[PDB]
Structures are given as C-alpha cells and as structure tokens.
Amino acid sequence: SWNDVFQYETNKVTRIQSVNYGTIKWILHMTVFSYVSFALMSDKLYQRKEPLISSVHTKVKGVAEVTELVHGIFDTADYTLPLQGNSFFVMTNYLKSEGQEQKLCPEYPSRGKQCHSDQGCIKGWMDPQSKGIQTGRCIPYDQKRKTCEIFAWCPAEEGKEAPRPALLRSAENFTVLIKNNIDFPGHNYTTRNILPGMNISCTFHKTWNPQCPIFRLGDIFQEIGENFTEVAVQGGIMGIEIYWDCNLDSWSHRCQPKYSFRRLDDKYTNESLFPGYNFRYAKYYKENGMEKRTLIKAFGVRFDILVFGTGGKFDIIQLVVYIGSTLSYFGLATVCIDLIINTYASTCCRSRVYPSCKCCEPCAVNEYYYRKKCEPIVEPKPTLKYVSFVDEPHIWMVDQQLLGKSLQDVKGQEVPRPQTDFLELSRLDSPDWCQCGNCLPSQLPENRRALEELCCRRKPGQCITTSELFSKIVLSREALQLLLLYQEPLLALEGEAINSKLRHCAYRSYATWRFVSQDMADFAILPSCCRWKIRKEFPKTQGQYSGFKYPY
Amino acid sequence: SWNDVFQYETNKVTRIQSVNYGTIKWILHMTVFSYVSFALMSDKLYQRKEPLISSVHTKVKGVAEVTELVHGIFDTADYTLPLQGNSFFVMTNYLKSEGQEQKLCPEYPSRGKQCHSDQGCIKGWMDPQSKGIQTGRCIPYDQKRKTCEIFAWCPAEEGKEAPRPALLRSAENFTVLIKNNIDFPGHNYTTRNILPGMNISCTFHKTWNPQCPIFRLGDIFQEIGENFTEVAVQGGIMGIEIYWDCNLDSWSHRCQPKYSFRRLDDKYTNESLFPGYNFRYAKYYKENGMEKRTLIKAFGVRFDILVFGTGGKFDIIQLVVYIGSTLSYFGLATVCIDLIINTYASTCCRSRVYPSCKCCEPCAVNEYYYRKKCEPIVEPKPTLKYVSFVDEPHIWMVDQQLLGKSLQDVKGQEVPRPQTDFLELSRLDSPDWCQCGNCLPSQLPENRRALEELCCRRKPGQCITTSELFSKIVLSREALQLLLLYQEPLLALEGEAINSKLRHCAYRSYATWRFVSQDMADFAILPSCCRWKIRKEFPKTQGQYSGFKYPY
Amino acid sequence: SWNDVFQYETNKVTRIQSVNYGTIKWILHMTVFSYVSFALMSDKLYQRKEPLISSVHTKVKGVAEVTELVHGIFDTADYTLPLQGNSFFVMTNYLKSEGQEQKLCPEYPSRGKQCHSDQGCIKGWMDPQSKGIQTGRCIPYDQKRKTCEIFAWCPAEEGKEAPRPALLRSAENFTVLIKNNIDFPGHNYTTRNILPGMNISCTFHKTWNPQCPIFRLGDIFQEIGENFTEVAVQGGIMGIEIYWDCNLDSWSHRCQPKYSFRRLDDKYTNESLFPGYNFRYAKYYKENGMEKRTLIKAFGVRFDILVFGTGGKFDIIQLVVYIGSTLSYFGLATVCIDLIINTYASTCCRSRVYPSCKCCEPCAVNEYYYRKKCEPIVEPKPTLKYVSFVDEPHIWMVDQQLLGKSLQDVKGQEVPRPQTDFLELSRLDSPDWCQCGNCLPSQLPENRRALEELCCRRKPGQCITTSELFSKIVLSREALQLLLLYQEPLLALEGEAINSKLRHCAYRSYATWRFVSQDMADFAILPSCCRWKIRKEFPKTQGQYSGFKYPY
Numbered sequence A, B, C: 001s002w003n004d005v006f007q008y009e010t011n012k013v014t015r016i017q018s019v020n021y022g023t024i025k026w027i028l029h030m031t032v033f034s035y036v037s038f039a040l041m042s043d044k045l046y047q048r049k050e051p052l053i054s055s056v057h058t059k060v061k062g063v064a065e066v067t068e069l070v071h072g073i074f075d076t077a078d079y080t081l082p083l084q085g086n087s088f089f090v091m092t093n094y095l096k097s098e099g100q101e102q103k104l105c106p107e108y109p110s111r112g113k114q115c116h117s118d119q120g121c122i123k124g125w126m127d128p129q130s131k132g133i134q135t136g137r138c139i140p141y142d143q144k145r146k147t148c149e150i151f152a153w154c155p156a157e158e159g160k161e162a163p164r165p166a167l168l169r170s171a172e173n174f175t176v177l178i179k180n181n182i183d184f185p186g187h188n189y190t191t192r193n194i195l196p197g198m199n200i201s202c203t204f205h206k207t208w209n210p211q212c213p214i215f216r217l218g219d220i221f222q223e224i225g226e227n228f229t230e231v232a233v234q235g236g237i238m239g240i241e242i243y244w245d246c247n248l249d250s251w252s253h254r255c256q257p258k259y260s261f262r263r264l265d266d267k268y269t270n271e272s273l274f275p276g277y278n279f280r281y282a283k284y285y286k287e288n289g290m291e292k293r294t295l296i297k298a299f300g301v302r303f304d305i306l307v308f309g310t311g312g313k314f315d316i317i318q319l320v321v322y323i324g325s326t327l328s329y330f331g332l333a334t335v336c337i338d339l340i341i342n343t344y345a346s347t348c349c350r351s352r353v354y355p356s357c358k359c360c361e362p363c364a365v366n367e368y369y370y371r372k373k374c375e376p377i378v379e380p381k382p383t384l385k386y387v388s389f390v391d392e393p394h395i396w397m398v399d400q401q402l403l404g405k406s407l408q409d410v411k412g413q414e415v416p417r418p419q420t421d422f423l424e425l426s427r428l429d430s431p432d433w434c435q436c437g438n439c440l441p442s443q444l445p446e447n448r449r450a451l452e453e454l455c456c457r458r459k460p461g462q463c464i465t466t467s468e469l470f471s472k473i474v475l476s477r478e479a480l481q482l483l484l485l486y487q488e489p490l491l492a493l494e495g496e497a498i499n500s501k502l503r504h505c506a507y508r509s510y511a512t513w514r515f516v517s518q519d520m521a522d523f524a525i526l527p528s529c530c531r532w533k534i535r536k537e538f539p540k541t542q543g544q545y546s547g548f549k550y551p552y
Ligand SMILES: Nc1nc2c(ncn2[C@@H]2O[C@H](COP(=O)(O)OP(=O)(O)O)[C@@H](O)[C@H]2O)c(=O)[nH]1
Pocket: A500, A503, A504, A507, A511, A521, A522, A523, A524, A525, A526, A527, A540, A543, A544, A545, A546, A547, A548, A549
C-alpha cells in the first residue's frame, strides 16, 4: 500500500555520442524556442487584454457669411445641432420654404412627376415621396406643366435639387476640438487625449502634429482624398477613428490615441436610395389663426467619432497558459531524430537506396542505434511456435492453427537467430516428413499429433543428434544434474521425478542451444528425433508423455 | 565539454506485435484527431477574431392624416426627431395643451389626487409628479372635485391618460431604410449592408427577402408577435439587431448581415415606473408681453439599431497555439494501453478475477509485457540486506535496523529469486539460531554481532555446505584462481593478499549462486556456516575479518 | 504491411522504490493540480465569454424655481433635452440674450479684448471667439472701453462669465430612473436591471440599496467626492457605469448590475480649451419684418451611461483547450527528479561537494540510479578503435585519424572496462613501440601499417601471451572448436576455411576477454604479439592476412 505509492518510474534511455544528432537536436530546440519567444513578445500573449469604454466631447468653431438681397451670418447656434458626443453635424447647404399651411396644392415637378390628366393621377393614395395625399385631380403647377394635386403643407418644394455650388462651402474652414476620455475598468486605468503641457494653437497633421485634437474639416477631407466642395452640395457621413493601442505595464507603458479618417457613406449610392446626408426641420408658429410652418432642408456632413482599442496588462494566468500550450513543441527534436533512426534502419535502405546514392552510406549506423533502442516482442498465444532446422541459418515462427497438417510442412515467418552471450561462451521406416531417419511417429492423440510431426532438417542429410555437441549439451547426465543442483542444491536424487526433471532440463537445454532467446525458447518445438532420443535417455515409468504445454 | 553537448538521448522501447493493442492505439489516435479537427474547423480556432465598428444611417418614410374639426397631415418633420443614427423615434399618439403661463392653478385630478381640504394638501412641497410647487391651498379643479393648488405652467394636464385608440396608428404602415457601414480595422476590411445590383422596391421578409434593408414597422412588430395597435397607445422601445458573422478568408469569404427584432421595453412595467415611451416637448414664444408655451406629450416607439458581430481571418499564431494545446491529447493511447498492461499484470487478477470470468483469461499475457517493460529496483541504503534459506524457495529482504536481535529471527519482505542466465548454464555446540549445526558464533563487536547471526536454513536439516556444488563453486581453489586471473591476467599470486582476494571471490561466488541478480548479491549476507567454511579455507594472518561492508 | 501497423511501442522504465522520490513526485503533482484547478475555477476558463448589447432608457424627475423680478419654474420640458438614451443633460446655469438681429455692433469685452484704436483691430477677419466678422472699425462698447466692431447677431454677450452661484443649484435634488436592458445574443440570454417585486420608493445607496436604479444627482456627486455646487457653475460630464458580470450557468446563475460613478471631464482643463459643459441654443422668429433670435447659453452636467460587461457560459471546447494547455505541466515531477538523478551521478559531486558537506553523502545513490537508467553508446565510425593495456586498469578509445603514427603512441579517451557477467563466471629485435618483446612488424601496407603497430603494455614487462589464460581462452583449439560447433553443429571441419574461422574466433575470444562489452569488442584492436601468436597457431595458406575490418 504505502510502498506502492512511494515509487518513482523513470524511462530507460540510450545516450548516443553523435555530432550530427546533437547538433540537429540543438538547432531544432533553438528554432522552437526562438519562434515561441517571438510569438509571445510580438503578440503580447502574456497580457490580459480589455476593450475600452469611451466618452467624447466635441466643440465646433467657425462662422460663415451667406448672401441672399439679405446678408446673414451662421454660427454654432445655426449650423450645429445640440449633439456634442460621438456625432456632430455641420451644415453645408440648405433649401428654404416659408409660410406653409396644411391645404390642397400641386406637387413639385421632380424627376418627371408631371401629371398629364386625371387618368394619370390617383385619388386616395399616400405618397411618401411628395409627403402628401393625392386627391385624384390634376391642376397646373405652372403655366406649362401640370402635376398631381396633394393635400399637405403648401407651398411644397419636395424634389427640388440642392443648390450648386454649396452655400456653406466655408464650413471646410471650420475646426472641431475633440476631447476623448477612455477607461479600462478591468485594469482600473483611465486617460484622456489631451494632456497637461500640450500646445493649444496647433491643428492636426498626420506627421507634423499627430497628437493635436483640433481638426480642420477641409484637412480631414484632403487627408483621404475627398473633395469637400463636391460633398458639400448633397452632404455625407465622415468617420473620425480614434484608436487606442495601450500597453499598461510599468516598464513599457504607452497609451496614446491614433487618428484616422474614413468616408462612411457610399459615394455611388443609387438615386432612389437617398444619396448624401440631409434632414428637414421646421419651426411651427400659428399666424392669423391658422397653423403655419417654416421648413428648411439642410444638407451637410455628419461626423461620427469612432473610438476603439484595447489595453493590455501582464497576467500570470495568460503566461502560464501560453507556456503550457507551447511546451509540447520541444518534442520536435525527439520526433525528428527518432524518425531518422527508424527510417534508416530499414533493410530497404541498403538494398535499394545506398547503391544509388553513396552519400547515404555513412548513415547505415542507424541500424545499430535501432537495435540498441528497440526490443521487438510478440504476443504469447496458444498457436505461437518456433522451429529451427539444422540445414537452415534462420528460425521459423508458426503463428497459425494446425488443421491436421504436420508442423514440418507448415510455413511461417522467417525470424533471425539472436546472437548468443559470447561473453559466457569465451570460457573453456522413417516417417514421410522425416528427412533425417531418426525421427519416430508421435504417440499423442490424432488431433494433436501434427504438433510433434517435425524434423530437424528440411532436406535429406545427417541428423542433429549425431553431433557430439548433442551428447555434451543435451544428453550429458552430469551436466543436467549440475544444472538441476544449481537451482536446488539439496535436491533429492530419488524416485521417478528425477527422470522427469532431467527430461525437462534436456528439452530446455536444446531449446536454449538452438533458440538463443528465452522468449523464443519458451515456444520452441523440439523435432521428433531429439525428443525421442531424450525420452530414450530418460524414460518415464507408467505414463504418457505430455509434450509441449502453454507456459501461460 | 563539447562532447557533453554533442549527445542525443532516446528512449528504450519494447515493440509489442499485438493485434488488440495496435487496433486500440489506432482507434484512439483517430478519435483524438477527429475531435481536434472538428473543434478546429467548427469553432474556426485558426482565426483571429475582431469586433466591428459600425455606423448607421436611417431614413423613415410615411405620412399620416389625423382629424381633430381640424384635418392635419404628419410627415417626417412632424413625427420624427432629427435622430438618424442608431435610434429613431416614430410618434404614435399625442396629447396637446396650448397657452401655458407660469402661474397658480389646480393640479389635474389623476389616480385619485383629489384634495379634500387644506389639511390634505401641503405648502412649500416640490411635486415632480405634477411638475409644480403646492401653495397649501385647496381650490376646486372642477365643480365636483377639488385638487391641490400648484404654481407651474397652466393649464396643467399632467396625469391625463393617453388617447385610445392611438391617433397615429397608421405609423405601422411607415417604412425605414437602414444603411449600415461596418469595419474591422485590425483586419483592414470594410463593407456595407447595401450592395450594387440590389433591388430597391423590396421590403424585408425573413424568408423571401432577408437582405432588403427596408423594414415596415408593422411587419417588425408582427414578426415577433407584438401588437402594434396596443403598443401605439403608450409607446415602447423596439430593437433592430444587425448581426455580422463575417469570414474574411479568401477561400471562404462571407460577410452578410442578419436582421432580428426584439422588444426592449418591459411589457409588464409597474404603473409607477412610467410604462411605455413618451416625452414632453414645448414651443416657447411670448405673447401679450407674457411668457407663453405650447406643450405636446408625444407617445411613440423608439427604435434602437443594435449592430454587433465579429470578423475572423486566418492567423498563424492562433493555429500554432491551438495545435500546441491539442498535442498532449495524442498520449491518450499510450496512457490507456499502459494502464491496461499495468492493471492486468497484478496477481489479484489471476487469483480473484480470472476464476470468476473466463473471458479475461487470454489477457494474462500482460504479465509478460510488464516484465519485459519494467525493471523494479530499490534504494541502496545501509540497512538493506538480503538473505536466502536453502529450505525455502524465495528470498527475504531485510530493510530495517537490527536492534541487537539476530538476523535469523528478523522478518523481511518476500522477493522472488530471479531466473538465471540459462544460456550460460546450458554449457558443460551450535548457536541457538543455527538450524544446521555448522554455524559458528560471530567475532564481530556486540552491537554488530547480530549482523552475522544468520543460518542457511529456517528449519533443522542438512547444511548447504554439505552439497558438492559448494565445493565446486565456492571452495574450488582452481575455479577462484581462474576467475581472478580473468580480470587480472598478470596477477601476482604471492603474499597474504591472494587469500584475501580468494575470500572475496568465494563470498561473491556464493552470493551470485544464491542471489542471481547482481543488484541483490551486493547486499546479500552470507550465513555463518558458509562464511566460516570459506574463512577456514582461506584464513587471514594477523588480523580480524571485517565482514559485510556498504558498497556505496 | 498489416503486421507493421498492428504494433504497439511502450517505454522501458525503471521503478525505483524510494521514499524521497515518491514523496517529491506526489508533492509536485499535487502542486501542479492545485494551481491548474485554481486557475480554471477563478478565471472560469471553462466558459465562453460574450460581450453584451445594451439599451438604456432614462427618466429625469425634478422641478426648480428661479427668481429673476420674474418668478419662473423649470420642469423636464425646460432643463432636459429629448435625449432619453445613453446620455441626458441637466441644466444647472444659464445666460439669456433676447432680441438679436444680424447687424454691426461692438464685441463684448472679455479677457481684455478691448480695442485701443482702428490699428489694433483688423478688417475682414473671421472671429470664432466672438462669432462675428470684424469690419476694422473701433467703436466704444461702453463709455469707458472700446472693442472691435463685428457684423453678427446683436446684442452680443460672448465671453460673459457664467453666473455664480449657479442659478439651478436645486438640480442636485433631481432624480433619474435608469432602465437598462442587456442581451447576450450568442448565449441567447436577456435581462433587465429592474425585476418584479423591486421596491420603487427607494433611492440608490452603495451599501443600503445597491440595486435601486433611482439616483439622486447630488448623491452621485457626493459618492465620488465631487462638489455639485461648484460644478454647477460651469457644468461638466459625469459617467454612470453599469457593469454586468454575469454567470449564465444553471448551477451558478448570477446576472446583476453594479453601479459606479466617474467624472468624465477634466477638472483642470485649460481656460482656452473650453472647461465645463455648455451649449448655445436659440429660438428664431421674425418680428417687424426683421429676422430676430433669442439665445440662451445653458451650462449643466451631461450624464453618460456606460454599460459594459461579459456573460460566460460553460463551453466544452474551452475546457478541452485549457486542459490540453495544462497537460504538459504534469511532467514537472519527471523533469525535476531526472535532473536530481543526473546531477548527483556526476563524479564532481563526490570529489568536491561531498567532503565539504556531509549532508549530501546519502545522495550518492543517484549513481546507481543513473547506471540503471542510461546506457551510453558511441557512433560506429571508421576511425573508432579500442585498445587495452595489461599494465593498465582501463581502456583507451582512439577516435581520430592515424597520420602514419603508430597506434601505440596515439592517445585517446579513458573509458572504464565494463563489469563482466559474473553469473556465468561463477561456474567451474622487437619493434621500437613494443614493450613486451613478442610483438612483430606488421605486413600490412605502409599507409595502414600503423593500425597494427600496437603493444599489449605501455611499460616494459611480461607479455600477456605468457599467461596460462591466453592458452586456455585464445589458443585452446578444443575450446574454439566447441564454440564454433555451438553456432553450427554440423560444420565441416575440412579445408583451409577451418583455420580462418579459428583465427576469427581467437580474435573475438581475446576481444571479449579484454573488452567485455560487445559494443567495444567489435572495434577493439589486438596487439601485435597476440595477433601473431594466433596467426602462428592457425596459419593461412597462400594469402595475406586482411586485418581489422569495419563491421558496418
Ligand atoms: N519448448 C518446448 N518444451 C517442451 C517440448 N516438449 C516438451 N516440452 C516441455 O516438457 C514438459 C513435458 O515433459 P514430458 O515429456 O511430457 O514429461 P512427462 O510430463 O513426465 O510425461 C512440458 O512442461 C513442456 O514445457 C518442446 O518441443 N518444446
């Protein structure tokens, strides 16, 4: 319990002393570190970002003189609405109509709205274009043309084109002072666009005076290539963008506004979609006991102040999350070099690639790395068997069911014989499937008999048992007794169990000798000749030999 | 230095040829990859997202005719304020009061505000409800009821209920054209909701014409199940939501507005919390040398245009961060299969689980995988000792202090004897704690004597030294000499150092034979019988035997 | 193909039974888990956050009485603009000017704008400060001073200071009711700041009544330490911040507003930058056939309602991304303990650190862990050679080109001789560079001769070949024959190939004996004495000895 949680597991590793792999690893590590640092610093991913809340206060300055003969002056109480926040309006043109009473009168002829006769007109129809209700009559607007008769404020001048050139062109010489107060409430920071010690006699310039909050309207239009004289005729919408890219860290504090301009209304608006910008405003006051009204259609530019931006401040959680996101990228060197080792250890490299390209020859050392790095094993299953023929240099793995066919004729995968422990070695008639002649028929049941139908060689020749090594290793009683006493020093050498143990040790001795690996010697199957020679050397009394058994 | 940084470390691995584990690994890999790809594509986590900046320009079209007998017409200069941005107001009802002068007069009787007598009223009290100052008198408002006397604009009509049905119901037939210009300044993209080639004679429909920016107000109310006729009596607030879900990538560019509607005022507002929407506006003009005023309480619907949304564009840093965040999820297959291997290699599986369920039987192969994967080691500490009794099949680890008690009676953990290197083996009176009789008392100091008080067996019987293997392996002088000359071929076989080396080699020979692992043979303790037989075979001259020493 | 994808690779590990390392691992795991959980819960990183869309409806209540003698009352139609959204204005002071006609008249003397003579004035100059056009004359404004003569609305009172104390001070006793409707459209949630069952007779207090949406203006000023009486003289801008920190999860639902106040205009604005807040508004109506105008300069406080906040709701993708970002932090225990193992296994620890500090002594066990964890290997390259001198206890690695110099005099890195497999061992004239006398000159070509110019010892003495172990291991014909028949039991012992194999086995036998590791024995170079003794024991017929060959 306690000893199970008081454990630490660490990976077994191979440390390769390689110039190429070391330099590749360090180059990849430096590349990953450089990119991660660059992404962290350029994007400021260690910071929490917060949008601002903004308040705008505008002040327009400028007066204009207009003739018609009546000479008048327009000041901020004339061309400017009480709007002093995000939007302000400057009038650049106007149309006047005095003395309007709600009564029947002909509509203004605009865009060919002339009425030929009462048939061309329609009674009881609401007309938003003329802002009246047609009575179905056709009275002459003028001595030449006739228009529909509407009940509305009269006289009506709807559809009259705006004066050209614009009357209040001098509005391009007006200036606006903009005061912008911004706040980041999450970061608990506030600031404004006008600081103490700032020059007040300046006007904004994108290069000379980029922080002066006083803007000449004509300069605003000239900056983005717009014609104030042309826009003044019908009006439009212009946007003054204030951008706050604010760094709220003490060591890199920077919170200044950036001013830009952008036309917000479509220059190519369809004629039916009301191009430009205007509004009709009226003063109402009855006279002679009759409701009167004076109407002015004012054209001008609406200015929208768009204030946006974010403020960033160092946050530990953001940095931790970013570092955790980038941590897995430092396995790139491992992935790349392991891919190099695995790829160049394949046999297809030496067979096909190396003869073609001799530059790839010194990279055959990856087979050594692969065999010092990976240990291939197979699943121990009931059908797993290993055979080895003395007339062959390799070993066969049979990993399929035997459907009565003898194990001799069954084919399997070719696996190589592992190299032995040379450190220790440095010390001082016959059946149809039998190609050696010493094999004997199996005494196992029929359905299992094919398991024991194996020969020591695939081709006719001498038997493995004929060699002196078979007697020295497998059949030597003294060697087997010493091996058995190594494990159990005080073993009782009496009874029939000693012969059973001796048979087991002879089988193992043979499996170890022919199948070097203990993983393969466990599932190795002895040929009939060796098996029956062993059983003739150590016979059992009153029983039947069990044969190979599954070690799991 | 340079050779220390020019190294590469790679993990040692075991490659298991398993159908089950391979298919599980690939299924888990595919599941993780599928979910990661789905999360990346559906949420567009490879994109940087930016909120928009918006500009709105509205145009209301519609005229109404109202009787009272005076017949009048209302156009955009009557029912519409100069607001043409995010909000516009449409008047649906009104109350009129002409000829107001600042003087004493009775308050309007509303919600039972009748005054019984001067006691019920109060002098010198500001009354925001009646918008006046009470003088403490109680004059009759009418021939029947009496109300408090206030100094304010007179005549006063505060508290008068709005007309029902609403006078300007026809405002439901009005239309509004909305022009919306949006910008993503970080992505440097701009667009508008009206494009060239768009039909202008349409009206918005959620299915037939979902991109027409012309909205009929009654249709707006009908879309969300609101009654324009009922809302028109007292007014309200309606929101036109413009949503921009914009994809700014070239291969998947899509930036269109989506229009929705939502009532913004509470339908069930408390009567004291001013339900509906209205405002009082007045025209001031003196007459007869006295300040006069005409007041209109206008009820109507305020429309708030709410424009919101984000624009996304592909960003390499976002993709890198997301991929780094998802990289660690590809260790799921390793975690799961390692848990399977570790869990099924426990002995509790075979003892308890396998007899109950026979389907779990073929999964006993995880013990082989575990023993081919993990190598358990223990911390080398001064109290670490190993003992092995010839009458027992296992080994005992003593990992605690000996408080004078003999090592024979001290209990320890049962560890198994590791399998030997069978590849190499295939070649050609007595003390009270002594159960064999050949043990001798220790000559070490008392406080350390208990270290050497160990017997070869826990039960009475034959001694380990009696076996011939003890003479062949431990006591054979020729074997020890050959072993010593293996390490040092030109060793000088003279002096008393040769006997010391021979004793050391005999101890090691015995430890290796009984404790197969070199990790366990280092801390193994020889029993007294073997130790003293060795020391009688190779005695030392003029000294005391040091005994077991800590190899670290 | 199919058997290549049906594989699973698992890491080989060492399980250390250590109290220190286990407790360190679990402490680090718990620390990482605790911090990750705290960061997830405190920052709610499992949630998708969305900004709100807001609608504001304000209602101001309050009336004031002002003397001048004319006694008047101001209600919401007097001091309040039709603004009922994010901003509303309350008038706190005013200046009046009646009967204005567009004509020539002297400018008001403000800030020393007196005109000494016509020289001091200028003709044809637009003056935004006085809102007129100077005609270049100098007429007396009063009997004492003279000012410039401008064509504008007359009489002009520009530059007149605001009345002190403020006329509408009682506006501090006014109240505003704020209705705020907020929506999260991505989360499909909507709410408002007034809920059913909320008291209506309350007023806001930051502690007693923090959810009452009725605010007294004087209380707003007192909360942030502002003086309403002083601000009322010239006006200002105040911000009512509504903050919505809304949790939209069912188990932790919380969506309430938080109210704060902040002055939005600069208290220390420069006199030339228009401090305070005011606007000039005029009523136009002609009289006596002449255009007249009444102008009022109104000073007051503009209130900006700033509504901001985010709503968060549980999102599975956010949680998955956060967990993936934090997953790599659980390798901290592995990194730390591996660093501990690697650091304390260095030899500099025992040589320098341990003698100084005896507390670091029990931590010398990390050498055992390091050698059970890491296997150092080197790149097999053509210049890789190993030598071992019998008069030395170590082995020399030569990893550089031999430029004709004999291998005996070439220096290399000192590598230690690995420990043998003691489990198996427990069983039963001369050239100038020759220091033993049995070496012979090499028969290889000159450019390669230096490869074979190696001696068995660096100092004069006995030769390695003189030992009996050389005959038993290397020169024993029977041992070599048994070793050869171990690999090939049916080998044909005929021809000259048997002597070649015997020479190869003798070289290997010697390399294994002197260079224990097979990785080092492959590149080991035999000294001339041993090589020529072997070749005299097994000479070849009609050929030249090839010598050492690169095994790759
Ligand atoms: N690897 C392997 N083991 C074998 C083979 N034949 C028998 N054995 C082992 O020998 C034991 C059976 O011995 P057996 O001849 O039946 O003696 P018995 O049990 O006394 O009749 C089993 O435990 C098997 O593991 C073989 O061909 N290959």
